[PDB]
Amino acid sequence: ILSELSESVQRIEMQGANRDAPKNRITTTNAAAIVSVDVDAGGTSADADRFVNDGRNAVRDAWTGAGNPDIANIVVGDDNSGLSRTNTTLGNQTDSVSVTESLPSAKVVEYSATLTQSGVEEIGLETSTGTLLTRATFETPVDLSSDTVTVTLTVSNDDSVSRGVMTNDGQTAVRDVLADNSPTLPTDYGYGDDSTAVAET
């Protein structure tokens, strides 16, 4: 019954479609960049981390040419709870300090600052306009006193996607968005005919 109904309505949907009409084509393609976060406070690694939806939005909007996020502050707080993609701010801020950029490799940004706070449960990166990129937390409170806090962002292709790739230059352009380092943003599209399989190189 369902297949006779389905065939009948399909026949009527296409009634009067000109089958010699001009055709046109849209190609659908997917690529993805992982930005992996690692956080070190005084030689203690964070036990959980997020690249939050406001950071994902900042890199998205920068890729549209709407301007890059200027990472300005490391921020530290009192509260391990609620760690999630949807965090717009720390659970409870206690201090913040100006970052220093470092670019140790083609696909890495490190933000470092020297800090003093007892009982730190959470760390984050903040853009000058207050937009949080990262939250990370510890199972046990950390005491910092003239200790370095480092946030390291590393860019990779998502090897889960099939027959599409972010090239090494594409992954470098995403690093250069996170750094505000004059990124080669998308400005052109190319089509070709060599079928040899995709690689980052």
Partner: protein, 32 residues
């Protein structure tokens, strides 16, 4: 004489919800 004295209710919602994945299957096998 002392020895002689020694002688399912089934939920229609949960069936119909559970079988949905299977009822629709032949039609998916035939496209739409």
């Amino acid at each position: 004489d002392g020895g002689g004295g020694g002688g399912a209710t089934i939920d229609g919602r949960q069936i119909s919800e559970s079988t949905g994945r299977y009822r629709s299957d032949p039609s998916r096998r035939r496209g739409i």
